[PDB]
């Protein structure tokens, strides 16, 4: 039997089972795994979501797991619902009204539908002179999606991840109940959902903190051939004072084998800059080159430009990059934030976007980042053709709320390490997958207490270790309370 409201969804053509629908909801950015759902729901309102989850909750024997597809940027099927129902969240934003994104009248925050993509949140905010404070390097991800993980970028060292910049949310639990939550109201659900990997319910609305929108960003890159100086300077630029001047701090690792091409492909360096760095590498006989990437946001004030210069000069004076290897650019804030989009367009035209992405993402405690550098950047990765950026930068644990579901290392400072390998070569996938296993293996044997990010484990003991035994029990308590039938986001392979 079907509850009337559920059947109504089918009657309205919102519940599709046609191959076209199921197929589109069966692959993800990872392009490594796939799983066909039984059906796909195209909700036109949150009420439709209530109908589905309510049916599931009251219908004894309900056999359909439910996933919430934002844009499907998952790497290993976390957004799939094998033989179940995949919710096409984007459908909530089809109507031209009411708006799915509203900047508060006082301009202190911005309400956004869980299905909205950050790029649109940005535009709507800027139209009101404001903008979120914490981002992701790539803006075409949904609010609910990044919030179910963490949401990190170069601003996280000072503002914390995106999950630390949410005032409240509207969530529909596995029981089918629409609940508003925050630190004050239904705090247990609030904490569970942030970094919750879609296990407790679907986020239909997130109240995001904002700040007055800067107009421009002085964008700089500093080059190093010495990892010690490189990491010491990143830690200096992101150290708690309150934080330094820098609005954003990330880093890059370039292996010597493809140095010229990788530098040229940053879209930041000129061919003249490239020649100099290539020469530097040969002079130091380096197998790896490192580059800090930072920015200083400022506005259109008449004195801004000159004020930024002095500020920048002061900071640079405290660092240790190779003499003369500071490279500057100045762009509009929105241009900087949406910088990766151009790379997507280019890669797609080359047919190098819709390829397997065996990405390795993790948080590495600062005390062992040097060992990681030796074992991976100067070791395992040497002698291979690398396609994709190798991102490395520190984060401050103090800006992370350990009460939330997201898992992080115990040290006060830990690094976000993102090796974005693209399997462009023929069947070069199997090799990259083995390489990632080797890297993880190296870390386990060296005793490095890392945490994976954006990865889904397939063994219960792995998830228990991921969260930590005690934090795991809390995760389970929240599971039994909000999704007792264990139907939500089965692709995480936690309770499925
Ligand atoms: C493809 C990609 C991903 C990416 C990135 C760049 C690219 C090209 N850059 C990132 C960055 O700089 N920083 C960061 O923290 N993450 C970055 N990502 C990874 C991205 O965050 C993840 O892919 C994330 O999952 C968001 O992607 P998306 O919004 O497309 O979501 P999904 O993959 O479809 O679903 C992920 C899981 O979340 C659950 N989910 C989705 N929406 C909701 C809502 N509204 N409520 C509750 N749960 C939700 C899904 O069910 C799934 O399990
Ligand atoms: C954005 O603001 C609009 C109002 O300015 C909200 O619109 C209401 O939305 C609910 C359901 O979401 C409807 O039942 C009401 O009829 C709508 N009223 C209006 C003015 O049309 C909307 O909910 C807000 N969305 C966000 C981002 O929270
Ligand atoms: C960095 O990579 C370059 C290749 O881009 C290496 O240069 C090659 O070195 C071999 C033997 O030393 C020569 O036979 C090739 O002709 C060189 N290629 C070039 C650039 O023409 C270089 O040795 C590497 N440096 C380090 C420190 O590993
Ligand atoms: C330039 O750097 C290279 C690479 O770090 C040095 O070559 C390594 O030398 C050690 C010990 O001599 C060997 O164990 C490695 O196998 C070598 N690297 C590889 C794989 O080729 C080289 O000695 C340095 N140049 C000098 C002598 O200054
Ligand atoms: O993905 C990125 N960062 C990231 C990704 C996943 C987790 C954490 C950070 N950065 C990035 C930069 C340029 N091009 C692309 Cl495709 C991606
Ligand atoms: C990966 O992408 C290719 C090209 O679009 C597609 O043919 C293939 O079915 C995809 N595989 C997976 C596992 O999604
Ligand atoms: C900054 O100036 C540019 C061009 O003068 C303008 O487009 C932009 O709207 C300004 N930023 C603000 C405060 O909106």
PDB file of N, CA and C and ligand atoms in Angstrom, residues 27 31-33 354, ligand 6:
ATOM      1  N   UNK A  27      25.483   7.835 -11.682  1.00  0.00           N
ATOM      2  CA  UNK A  27      26.917   8.116 -11.779  1.00  0.00           C
ATOM      3  C   UNK A  27      27.239   9.393 -11.014  1.00  0.00           C
ATOM      4  N   UNK A  31      33.177   8.978 -11.107  1.00  0.00           N
ATOM      5  CA  UNK A  31      33.183   8.241 -12.365  1.00  0.00           C
ATOM      6  C   UNK A  31      33.926   6.917 -12.199  1.00  0.00           C
ATOM      7  N   UNK A  32      33.926   6.375 -10.986  1.00  0.00           N
ATOM      8  CA  UNK A  32      34.610   5.122 -10.712  1.00  0.00           C
ATOM      9  C   UNK A  32      33.602   4.042 -10.353  1.00  0.00           C
ATOM     10  N   UNK A  33      32.544   4.438  -9.660  1.00  0.00           N
ATOM     11  CA  UNK A  33      31.502   3.503  -9.260  1.00  0.00           C
ATOM     12  C   UNK A  33      30.157   4.041  -9.710  1.00  0.00           C
ATOM     13  N   UNK A 354      35.113  14.718 -17.615  1.00  0.00           N
ATOM     14  CA  UNK A 354      34.284  13.556 -17.340  1.00  0.00           C
ATOM     15  C   UNK A 354      35.126  12.283 -17.456  1.00  0.00           C
TER      16      UNK A 354
HETATM   17  C1  LIG B   6      32.393   7.282 -16.431  1.00  0.00           C
HETATM   18  O1  LIG B   6      32.232   8.287 -17.440  1.00  0.00           O
HETATM   19  C2  LIG B   6      32.160   7.716 -18.763  1.00  0.00           C
HETATM   20  C3  LIG B   6      32.172   8.862 -19.757  1.00  0.00           C
HETATM   21  O2  LIG B   6      31.076   9.740 -19.544  1.00  0.00           O
HETATM   22  C4  LIG B   6      30.914   6.836 -18.874  1.00  0.00           C
HETATM   23  O3  LIG B   6      30.861   6.241 -20.161  1.00  0.00           O
HETATM   24  C5  LIG B   6      30.956   5.741 -17.802  1.00  0.00           C
HETATM   25  O4  LIG B   6      29.734   5.017 -17.811  1.00  0.00           O
HETATM   26  C6  LIG B   6      31.184   6.345 -16.410  1.00  0.00           C
HETATM   27  N1  LIG B   6      31.423   5.278 -15.459  1.00  0.00           N
HETATM   28  C7  LIG B   6      30.958   5.363 -14.219  1.00  0.00           C
HETATM   29  C8  LIG B   6      31.446   4.315 -13.231  1.00  0.00           C
HETATM   30  O5  LIG B   6      30.171   6.235 -13.855  1.00  0.00           O
END
